[PDB]
Coordinates of C-alpha atoms and ligand atoms in Angstrom, one line a residue:
Chain A
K1 CA 124.4 133.9 146.5
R2 CA 121.4 132.7 144.5
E3 CA 122.2 129.0 145.3
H4 CA 122.3 130.0 149.0
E5 CA 119.0 131.8 148.9
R6 CA 117.6 128.6 147.6
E7 CA 119.1 126.5 150.4
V8 CA 117.7 128.8 153.0
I9 CA 114.0 128.5 151.9
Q10 CA 114.6 124.8 151.5
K11 CA 115.9 124.5 155.0
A12 CA 112.8 126.5 156.2
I13 CA 110.5 124.1 154.5
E14 CA 112.4 121.1 155.7
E15 CA 112.5 122.1 159.3
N16 CA 108.8 122.9 159.3
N17 CA 108.0 119.5 157.6
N18 CA 110.1 117.8 160.2
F19 CA 108.4 119.5 163.0
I20 CA 105.1 118.2 161.8
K21 CA 106.4 114.7 161.2
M22 CA 107.9 114.3 164.6
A23 CA 104.7 115.6 166.3
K24 CA 102.6 113.1 164.3
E25 CA 104.9 110.3 165.3
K26 CA 105.1 111.2 169.0
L27 CA 101.3 111.7 169.1
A28 CA 100.7 108.2 167.6
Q29 CA 103.1 106.4 169.8
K30 CA 101.5 108.0 172.9
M31 CA 98.0 107.0 171.8
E32 CA 98.8 103.4 171.1
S33 CA 100.8 103.0 174.2
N34 CA 98.0 104.6 176.2
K35 CA 95.5 102.2 174.6
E36 CA 97.7 99.2 175.5
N37 CA 98.1 100.3 179.1
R38 CA 94.4 100.9 179.5
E39 CA 93.5 97.5 178.0
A40 CA 96.0 95.6 180.2
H41 CA 94.7 97.4 183.4
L42 CA 91.1 96.4 182.4
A43 CA 92.0 92.8 181.4
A44 CA 93.6 92.3 184.8
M45 CA 90.6 93.7 186.7
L46 CA 88.2 91.5 184.9
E47 CA 90.4 88.3 185.4
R48 CA 90.7 88.9 189.1
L49 CA 86.9 89.0 189.0
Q50 CA 86.8 85.8 186.9
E51 CA 89.0 84.2 189.6
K52 CA 86.2 85.2 192.1
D53 CA 83.8 83.1 190.0
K54 CA 86.1 80.1 189.9
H55 CA 86.5 80.3 193.7
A56 CA 82.8 80.6 194.2
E57 CA 82.0 77.4 192.2
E58 CA 84.8 75.8 194.1
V59 CA 83.1 76.8 197.5
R60 CA 79.7 75.5 196.4
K61 CA 81.2 72.2 194.9
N62 CA 82.9 71.6 198.3
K63 CA 79.5 72.1 200.1
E64 CA 77.6 69.6 198.1
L65 CA 80.7 67.3 198.6
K66 CA 79.7 67.0 202.3
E67 CA 77.5 64.0 203.3
Chain B
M1 CA 119.3 162.3 129.0
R2 CA 121.1 159.5 131.0
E3 CA 118.2 157.8 132.8
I4 CA 117.9 156.8 136.4
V5 CA 115.5 154.1 137.5
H6 CA 114.0 154.8 141.0
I7 CA 112.8 152.0 143.3
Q8 CA 111.1 152.6 146.7
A9 CA 110.5 149.6 149.0
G10 CA 108.5 149.2 152.3
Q11 CA 106.7 151.7 154.4
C12 CA 109.6 154.0 155.0
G13 CA 111.1 153.7 151.5
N14 CA 107.6 154.5 150.0
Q15 CA 106.9 157.4 152.3
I16 CA 110.2 159.2 151.6
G17 CA 110.1 158.2 147.9
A18 CA 106.6 159.7 147.5
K19 CA 107.8 162.7 149.2
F20 CA 110.9 163.0 146.9
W21 CA 108.6 162.8 143.8
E22 CA 106.3 165.5 145.1
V23 CA 109.2 167.8 145.8
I24 CA 111.2 167.4 142.6
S25 CA 108.0 167.3 140.5
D26 CA 107.2 170.8 141.8
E27 CA 110.9 171.8 141.2
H28 CA 110.4 170.8 137.5
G29 CA 106.9 172.3 137.2
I30 CA 105.3 168.9 136.6
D31 CA 101.8 168.7 138.2
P32 CA 99.9 165.7 139.5
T33 CA 98.6 164.8 136.0
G34 CA 102.0 164.7 134.4
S35 CA 101.6 168.1 132.7
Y36 CA 104.3 170.7 132.7
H37 CA 103.4 174.2 133.8
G38 CA 106.6 176.1 134.6
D39 CA 108.4 179.1 133.3
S40 CA 111.9 178.1 132.7
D41 CA 113.6 175.7 130.5
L42 CA 116.2 174.8 133.1
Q43 CA 113.3 172.7 134.3
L44 CA 113.1 170.6 131.2
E45 CA 116.6 170.2 130.1
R46 CA 117.4 167.1 132.2
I47 CA 113.9 166.0 133.0
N48 CA 114.4 162.7 131.2
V49 CA 116.9 161.7 134.0
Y50 CA 113.9 161.0 136.2
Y51 CA 110.7 161.2 133.9
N52 CA 109.7 159.3 130.8
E53 CA 107.8 161.3 128.2
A54 CA 104.4 160.0 127.4
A55 CA 102.3 161.1 124.4
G56 CA 100.0 164.0 125.2
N57 CA 103.1 165.9 126.5
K58 CA 102.9 163.9 129.8
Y59 CA 105.8 163.1 132.2
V60 CA 105.7 159.8 134.1
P61 CA 108.2 159.3 137.0
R62 CA 110.6 156.5 136.2
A63 CA 109.7 154.9 139.6
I64 CA 108.8 151.5 140.9
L65 CA 106.8 151.2 144.1
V66 CA 107.3 147.9 146.1
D67 CA 106.0 146.5 149.4
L68 CA 105.0 143.2 150.9
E69 CA 101.8 144.8 152.2
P70 CA 99.1 146.9 150.5
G71 CA 98.8 149.5 153.3
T72 CA 101.2 152.3 152.2
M73 CA 100.4 151.7 148.6
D74 CA 96.7 152.5 148.7
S75 CA 97.9 155.4 150.7
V76 CA 100.4 156.6 148.1
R77 CA 98.0 155.9 145.2
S78 CA 95.8 158.4 147.0
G79 CA 98.5 160.9 148.1
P80 CA 98.6 164.3 146.4
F81 CA 100.9 163.0 143.6
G82 CA 99.5 159.5 143.6
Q83 CA 97.9 159.7 140.2
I84 CA 101.2 160.5 138.6
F85 CA 102.8 157.1 138.8
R86 CA 102.5 154.5 136.2
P87 CA 99.9 151.9 137.5
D88 CA 101.6 148.6 136.5
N89 CA 104.6 150.0 138.4
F90 CA 103.0 149.4 141.8
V91 CA 104.2 145.9 142.8
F92 CA 102.8 144.6 146.1
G93 CA 102.1 141.4 148.1
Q94 CA 99.6 140.6 150.8
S95 CA 101.2 139.4 154.0
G96 CA 103.9 141.9 154.9
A97 CA 107.3 140.9 156.4
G98 CA 106.7 141.6 160.1
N99 CA 110.0 143.5 160.6
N100 CA 111.9 140.4 159.8
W101 CA 114.8 140.7 157.3
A102 CA 114.9 136.9 156.7
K103 CA 111.3 137.1 155.5
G104 CA 112.1 140.1 153.3
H105 CA 115.3 138.6 151.8
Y106 CA 114.5 134.8 151.8
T107 CA 110.9 133.7 152.0
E108 CA 108.1 136.1 151.2
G109 CA 110.3 138.7 149.4
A110 CA 111.6 135.8 147.3
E111 CA 108.0 135.4 146.0
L112 CA 107.5 139.0 144.8
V113 CA 110.9 140.0 143.5
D114 CA 110.6 138.5 140.0
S115 CA 107.5 140.7 139.4
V116 CA 109.5 143.7 140.5
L117 CA 112.4 142.8 138.3
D118 CA 110.1 142.5 135.3
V119 CA 109.0 146.1 135.8
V120 CA 112.6 147.2 136.3
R121 CA 113.5 145.4 133.0
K122 CA 110.8 147.1 131.1
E123 CA 111.9 150.5 132.4
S124 CA 115.5 149.8 131.5
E125 CA 114.9 148.5 128.0
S126 CA 113.3 151.8 127.1
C127 CA 116.3 153.9 128.1
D128 CA 118.7 155.5 125.8
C129 CA 121.7 155.5 128.2
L130 CA 120.7 154.1 131.7
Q131 CA 123.0 155.5 134.4
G132 CA 121.6 153.2 137.0
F133 CA 119.5 152.8 140.0
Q134 CA 118.4 154.5 143.1
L135 CA 116.6 153.0 146.1
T136 CA 114.8 154.5 149.1
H137 CA 114.2 152.2 152.1
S138 CA 114.9 151.8 155.8
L139 CA 117.3 149.3 157.2
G140 CA 115.5 148.5 160.4
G141 CA 112.2 146.9 159.0
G142 CA 111.8 143.7 156.9
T143 CA 110.7 144.8 153.4
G144 CA 112.9 147.8 152.7
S145 CA 115.7 146.1 154.5
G146 CA 115.6 142.4 153.5
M147 CA 113.7 142.6 150.3
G148 CA 115.3 145.9 149.2
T149 CA 118.7 144.4 149.6
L150 CA 117.7 141.2 147.8
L151 CA 116.6 143.5 144.9
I152 CA 119.9 145.2 144.9
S153 CA 121.6 141.9 144.6
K154 CA 119.4 140.8 141.7
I155 CA 119.7 144.2 139.9
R156 CA 123.5 144.0 140.2
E157 CA 123.4 140.6 138.6
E158 CA 121.5 141.7 135.5
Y159 CA 123.2 145.1 135.3
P160 CA 126.7 144.7 136.6
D161 CA 128.0 147.9 135.0
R162 CA 125.4 150.4 136.1
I163 CA 125.7 152.6 139.3
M164 CA 123.7 151.6 142.3
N165 CA 122.7 154.3 144.7
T166 CA 120.6 154.1 148.0
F167 CA 119.0 156.4 150.5
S168 CA 119.1 154.2 153.6
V169 CA 117.4 155.2 156.7
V170 CA 119.2 154.1 159.8
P171 CA 117.2 153.0 162.8
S172 CA 117.3 154.6 166.2
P173 CA 115.6 153.6 169.5
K174 CA 114.5 157.3 169.8
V175 CA 112.1 156.6 167.0
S176 CA 111.4 152.9 167.2
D177 CA 111.0 150.4 169.9
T178 CA 111.1 147.3 167.8
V179 CA 113.8 145.2 169.3
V180 CA 115.2 143.4 166.3
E181 CA 116.0 146.6 164.3
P182 CA 119.8 146.2 165.0
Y183 CA 119.6 142.7 163.5
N184 CA 117.9 143.9 160.3
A185 CA 120.2 146.9 160.1
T186 CA 123.4 144.9 160.5
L187 CA 122.3 142.3 157.9
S188 CA 121.4 145.1 155.6
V189 CA 124.6 147.1 156.0
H190 CA 126.5 143.9 155.1
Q191 CA 124.7 143.8 151.8
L192 CA 125.1 147.5 151.2
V193 CA 128.9 147.4 151.6
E194 CA 129.2 144.8 148.9
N195 CA 126.6 145.8 146.4
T196 CA 126.2 149.5 146.3
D197 CA 128.3 152.4 144.9
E198 CA 127.0 155.3 147.0
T199 CA 124.8 155.1 150.1
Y200 CA 123.4 158.2 151.7
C201 CA 122.9 157.4 155.5
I202 CA 119.8 159.0 156.8
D203 CA 119.9 158.5 160.5
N204 CA 116.6 158.5 162.4
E205 CA 118.4 159.6 165.5
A206 CA 119.7 162.7 163.7
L207 CA 116.4 163.6 162.2
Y208 CA 114.7 163.2 165.5
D209 CA 117.2 165.4 167.4
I210 CA 117.1 168.0 164.7
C211 CA 113.2 168.1 165.1
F212 CA 113.3 168.2 168.8
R213 CA 116.3 170.3 169.8
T214 CA 116.4 172.7 166.8
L215 CA 113.0 172.9 165.1
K216 CA 111.5 172.9 168.6
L217 CA 109.0 170.2 167.9
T218 CA 108.0 168.6 171.2
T219 CA 106.3 165.6 169.6
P220 CA 107.8 165.0 166.2
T221 CA 105.9 162.8 163.7
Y222 CA 107.3 160.8 160.8
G223 CA 106.0 163.5 158.5
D224 CA 108.3 165.9 160.4
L225 CA 111.3 163.6 159.9
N226 CA 110.4 163.0 156.2
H227 CA 110.3 166.7 155.6
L228 CA 114.1 166.8 156.4
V229 CA 114.7 163.7 154.3
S230 CA 113.0 165.2 151.2
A231 CA 114.9 168.6 151.4
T232 CA 118.1 166.5 151.6
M233 CA 117.2 164.3 148.7
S234 CA 116.3 167.2 146.6
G235 CA 119.6 168.8 147.5
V236 CA 121.7 165.8 146.8
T237 CA 120.2 165.2 143.4
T238 CA 120.3 168.8 142.2
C239 CA 123.5 168.2 140.1
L240 CA 121.8 165.2 138.4
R241 CA 118.7 167.1 137.6
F242 CA 120.0 170.5 136.4
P243 CA 122.7 171.6 133.9
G244 CA 126.1 171.9 135.5
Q245 CA 129.7 170.8 135.6
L246 CA 130.2 169.0 138.8
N247 CA 128.9 165.6 139.7
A248 CA 126.4 165.8 136.9
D249 CA 125.9 162.1 136.7
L250 CA 126.0 159.1 139.2
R251 CA 129.4 157.8 137.9
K252 CA 131.1 161.3 138.1
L253 CA 129.7 161.6 141.6
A254 CA 131.1 158.2 142.7
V255 CA 134.6 158.9 141.3
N256 CA 134.8 162.2 143.2
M257 CA 133.4 160.7 146.4
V258 CA 134.7 157.1 146.8
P259 CA 138.4 156.7 147.2
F260 CA 138.1 153.1 148.4
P261 CA 135.2 150.9 147.3
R262 CA 133.9 150.0 150.7
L263 CA 133.8 153.5 152.1
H264 CA 130.8 154.7 150.1
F265 CA 128.6 155.8 153.0
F266 CA 127.8 159.5 153.1
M267 CA 126.7 162.1 155.7
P268 CA 124.3 164.5 154.1
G269 CA 123.8 168.0 155.6
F270 CA 121.5 170.8 155.0
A271 CA 120.8 174.6 155.5
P272 CA 118.6 176.2 156.4
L273 CA 116.8 173.6 158.5
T274 CA 113.0 174.2 158.5
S275 CA 109.8 172.8 159.7
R276 CA 106.7 172.3 157.6
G277 CA 104.6 175.3 156.9
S278 CA 106.3 177.6 159.4
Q279 CA 107.7 180.5 157.6
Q280 CA 111.0 181.7 156.1
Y281 CA 111.0 185.4 155.9
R282 CA 114.8 186.1 155.9
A283 CA 117.1 184.6 153.3
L284 CA 120.4 183.3 154.7
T285 CA 123.6 184.9 153.6
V286 CA 126.4 183.0 151.8
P287 CA 128.4 183.0 155.1
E288 CA 125.5 181.7 157.1
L289 CA 124.7 178.9 154.6
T290 CA 128.4 177.9 154.8
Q291 CA 128.7 177.8 158.5
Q292 CA 125.3 176.0 158.9
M293 CA 125.7 173.3 156.3
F294 CA 129.0 172.1 158.0
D295 CA 127.4 172.3 161.4
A296 CA 127.1 169.0 163.2
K297 CA 123.6 170.0 164.0
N298 CA 122.7 170.1 160.4
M299 CA 123.9 166.5 159.5
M300 CA 121.3 163.8 158.8
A301 CA 123.6 161.2 160.4
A302 CA 124.3 161.6 164.1
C303 CA 128.1 161.7 163.9
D304 CA 130.4 164.2 165.3
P305 CA 132.5 165.5 162.3
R306 CA 135.2 166.8 164.7
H307 CA 135.6 163.2 165.7
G308 CA 136.9 162.2 162.2
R309 CA 138.3 163.5 158.9
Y310 CA 136.7 164.3 155.6
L311 CA 138.0 162.1 152.8
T312 CA 135.9 164.0 150.2
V313 CA 133.0 166.6 150.3
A314 CA 130.6 167.9 147.7
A315 CA 128.8 171.1 148.4
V316 CA 125.8 172.5 146.6
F317 CA 124.5 176.0 146.8
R318 CA 121.0 176.9 145.3
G319 CA 119.3 180.2 144.5
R320 CA 120.8 183.3 142.9
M321 CA 123.9 184.5 144.8
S322 CA 127.5 185.6 144.3
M323 CA 129.7 182.7 143.0
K324 CA 132.7 184.8 144.0
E325 CA 131.4 184.8 147.6
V326 CA 130.6 181.1 147.6
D327 CA 134.2 180.6 146.5
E328 CA 135.7 182.6 149.3
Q329 CA 133.4 181.1 151.9
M330 CA 134.3 177.6 150.8
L331 CA 138.0 178.3 150.8
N332 CA 137.6 180.0 154.2
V333 CA 135.9 176.9 155.7
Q334 CA 138.8 174.6 154.5
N335 CA 141.6 177.0 155.4
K336 CA 140.2 177.7 158.9
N337 CA 139.7 174.0 159.5
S338 CA 142.4 172.4 157.4
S339 CA 143.0 169.5 159.8
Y340 CA 139.6 167.9 159.3
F341 CA 140.4 167.3 155.7
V342 CA 142.8 164.6 154.8
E343 CA 146.0 166.1 153.4
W344 CA 146.5 163.0 151.2
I345 CA 143.5 163.8 148.9
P346 CA 144.4 167.3 147.7
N347 CA 141.5 169.6 146.9
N348 CA 138.9 167.2 148.1
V349 CA 136.0 169.7 148.5
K350 CA 134.0 170.4 145.3
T351 CA 131.4 173.1 144.9
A352 CA 128.4 173.6 142.7
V353 CA 125.9 176.4 142.4
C354 CA 122.5 176.0 140.8
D355 CA 120.4 179.1 140.1
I356 CA 117.0 177.5 141.0
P357 CA 116.3 177.6 144.8
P358 CA 114.0 175.1 146.5
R359 CA 110.3 175.8 147.0
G360 CA 109.9 178.4 149.7
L361 CA 113.5 179.4 150.1
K362 CA 115.5 182.1 148.4
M363 CA 118.6 180.1 149.2
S364 CA 120.0 176.9 150.6
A365 CA 123.0 174.7 150.7
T366 CA 123.4 170.9 150.7
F367 CA 126.4 169.1 152.0
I368 CA 127.5 165.5 151.2
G369 CA 130.5 164.3 153.1
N370 CA 132.5 161.1 153.1
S371 CA 133.8 161.4 156.6
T372 CA 135.5 158.8 158.8
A373 CA 133.2 159.9 161.6
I374 CA 130.4 157.9 160.0
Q375 CA 132.1 155.0 161.9
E376 CA 130.2 156.2 164.9
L377 CA 126.8 155.2 163.4
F378 CA 128.1 151.8 162.6
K379 CA 129.5 151.5 166.0
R380 CA 126.2 152.3 167.6
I381 CA 124.4 149.6 165.5
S382 CA 127.1 147.1 166.2
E383 CA 126.9 147.7 170.0
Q384 CA 123.1 147.2 169.9
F385 CA 123.6 144.1 167.8
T386 CA 126.3 142.5 170.0
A387 CA 124.3 143.0 173.2
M388 CA 121.6 140.8 171.8
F389 CA 123.6 138.5 169.7
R390 CA 126.0 137.4 172.4
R391 CA 123.0 135.7 174.0
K392 CA 121.4 134.8 170.8
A393 CA 118.3 136.7 171.8
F394 CA 115.4 136.9 169.3
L395 CA 117.3 134.7 166.8
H396 CA 114.5 132.1 166.6
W397 CA 112.6 134.6 164.4
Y398 CA 115.4 134.4 161.9
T399 CA 116.3 130.7 162.1
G400 CA 112.6 129.8 161.9
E401 CA 112.9 131.2 158.3
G402 CA 115.9 129.0 157.6
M403 CA 118.8 131.4 158.4
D404 CA 121.9 130.1 160.2
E405 CA 123.8 131.9 163.0
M406 CA 126.9 131.9 160.8
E407 CA 125.2 134.4 158.5
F408 CA 124.9 136.7 161.5
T409 CA 128.5 136.3 162.5
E410 CA 129.6 137.2 159.0
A411 CA 127.4 140.3 158.8
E412 CA 128.8 141.4 162.2
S413 CA 132.3 140.8 161.1
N414 CA 132.0 142.6 157.8
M415 CA 130.6 145.6 159.7
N416 CA 133.3 145.5 162.4
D417 CA 135.9 145.5 159.5
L418 CA 134.2 148.4 157.9
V419 CA 134.5 150.4 161.2
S420 CA 138.1 149.6 161.4
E421 CA 138.8 150.6 157.8
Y422 CA 137.4 154.0 158.6
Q423 CA 139.7 154.2 161.7
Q424 CA 142.7 153.2 159.6
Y425 CA 142.1 156.2 157.3
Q426 CA 141.4 158.6 160.2
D427 CA 144.9 158.0 161.5
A428 CA 146.8 157.6 158.2
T429 CA 149.2 160.6 157.7
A430 CA 151.3 161.7 154.7
Ligands
LIG1 C1 102.3 156.0 170.8 C2 103.7 156.7 170.8 C3 104.2 156.9 169.4 C4 103.3 157.7 168.6 C5 105.5 157.6 169.7 N1 106.4 156.9 170.6 C6 107.2 155.9 170.5 O1 107.3 155.2 169.5 C7 108.1 155.5 171.8 C8 107.2 155.8 173.1 C9 108.0 155.3 174.3 C10 109.4 154.7 174.1 C11 110.3 155.5 173.1 N2 109.5 156.0 171.9 C12 110.3 155.8 170.7 C13 106.1 158.4 168.5 O2 106.0 159.6 168.8 N3 106.5 158.0 167.3 C14 106.5 156.6 166.9 C15 106.8 159.0 166.2 C16 106.2 158.6 164.9 C17 104.7 158.8 165.0 O3 104.4 160.0 165.8 C18 103.1 160.5 166.0 C19 102.9 161.6 167.1 O4 102.0 160.2 165.3 C20 103.9 158.8 163.8 N4 103.8 159.8 162.9 C21 103.0 159.7 161.9 C22 102.8 160.5 160.9 O5 103.8 161.4 160.7 N5 101.8 160.3 160.1 C23 101.5 161.1 158.8 C24 101.4 160.1 157.7 C25 102.4 159.1 157.8 C26 103.7 159.4 157.3 C27 104.8 158.4 157.4 C28 104.6 157.2 157.9 C29 103.3 156.8 158.4 C30 102.2 157.8 158.3 C31 100.3 162.0 159.0 C32 100.5 163.5 159.1 C33 99.7 164.3 160.2 C34 102.1 164.0 159.2 O6 102.6 164.2 158.0 O7 102.6 164.4 160.2 C35 102.2 158.5 161.9 S1 102.7 157.6 163.4 C36 108.3 159.6 166.3 C37 109.2 159.0 167.3 C38 108.9 159.7 165.0
LIG2 N1 112.1 158.6 158.8 C1 111.2 157.6 158.7 N2 111.3 156.5 159.3 C2 110.4 155.5 159.1 C3 109.2 155.8 158.4 N3 108.4 154.7 158.4 C4 109.1 153.8 159.2 N4 110.3 154.3 159.6 C5 111.3 153.6 160.4 O1 111.7 152.4 159.6 C6 111.9 151.2 160.4 C7 110.8 150.2 160.1 O2 110.8 150.0 158.7 P1 109.6 150.0 157.7 O3 109.9 150.7 156.5 O4 108.3 150.5 158.4 O5 109.3 148.5 157.4 P2 109.1 147.7 156.1 O6 107.8 148.2 155.5 O7 109.3 146.2 156.5 O8 110.3 148.1 155.3 C8 111.8 151.8 161.9 O9 113.1 152.4 162.2 C9 110.9 153.0 161.7 O10 111.0 154.0 162.7 C10 109.1 157.1 157.7 O11 108.1 157.4 157.0 N5 110.1 157.9 157.9
LIG3 MG1 105.8 148.1 157.0

């Protein structure tokens, strides 16, 4: 009985520790995955816009290439 | 003489315990300071059973007060008798067990129990011939229930050859609406069946019906309930506290009352039933005491005695009266009802008379019965338990403290087996 009493409080502690650990883990994966998604979505928006600059030099070059 | 150590645990345990100390202190002419002021020496002969003798001619109850919360103990410290208890004998924690047996038995109760055990040890060591232990507590809360049964288990380990005795208050939905009380009670009963020698079942349902139906109290309080409890406790410990022949110590009591080790749960009874203050002008006759104390309406456990059989019965009459008449009236009760008494334990009713009546009465009688009808109380707890357990309702409060369901299935099984053992003996013939 006394060894069992010890296991029980041990199990309590363990399950509580494990609840915290899992929550920390799930929180951190969600944060970094949200950070990546948001970076990508902004990288792509800016490069689309960069491609507008390439195309606008290309339209002006083509103009001055007319004699 | 042979010393008894008293432990009271939790709100209920400490309320009924305090109340016991008040009552027997007055029966022995010991006043709140520890000073004797009575006029008989019957009062002092066996005082050492319950009181240590301090220098200055003072009596200190041999009593340990335990709870996981401070509440009821500030309250007892400042009761009428509060100043009587030894102060390092109050053992208390801070957070309370929230009506959770797992907390009482395994997690918070775990923390405090070594401090209790040290006080118990200290009280033991200074005893010439320790008879054993008695505990007051309820089964439906968390401290009295889960911690109190943890204590019993630890005391049994250090003192395997002393008698362990409890006064166990059984929960009822007439008194309490806390939903998990059948869980705490079933877990507790499981412990009690293994680790006690005698258990007096005080059933909250019985006390409430007595108060309502008979004492005509439309709104009973706990104080009303506890008044019936303390009369009873005084009654059942008479033989231990006064000179006499029958059941004069815990072990003699257990050998007269317990034919099989598991069936050690008793129905106490009492006459006359009274409410606090309100007045007792007419003494009962020996025939009235006798009919009343065996009345189902006088039992502190809500069982119907005609539904079972008495294995053994101890009866105690108090106040000055005719022993001859006690004797005819007792014989008359058994002869007129012989079929409620198992033929295979001959002469299973024992009777004591003590000359000193209880405060405010010229005479009373106390009954202690080991009846198979006590199965009814266990059946009621079991039905409440199973309705919840079959859906695992409210279990998360228990597993959140580390318990496993298995522990619940075992308690339930042990209790179902208890009930069927009583049934086996109700039907056994000779
Ligand atoms: C708000 C309603 C509760 C008061 C009440 N009702 C119920 O609990 C519900 C209500 C609806 C569903 C089914 N029933 C069970 C109740 O009467 N209860 C809990 C009492 C107990 C309760 O009653 C009253 C009227 O106060 C309490 N009694 C005391 C009490 O005795 N306190 C004494 C001190 C004391 C003693 C022991 C424990 C705590 C406090 C103080 C004095 C005046 C006395 O001795 O009578 C405190 S709470 C009985 C069923 C036993
Ligand atoms: N008869 C009686 N029953 C009580 C008293 N106090 C609490 N109870 C009952 O005991 C159960 C709760 O136990 P309690 O002792 O308060 O909890 P603990 O402090 O965790 O042991 C419920 O059934 C209550 O109705 C009391 O003073 N007298
Ligand atoms: Mg409490």
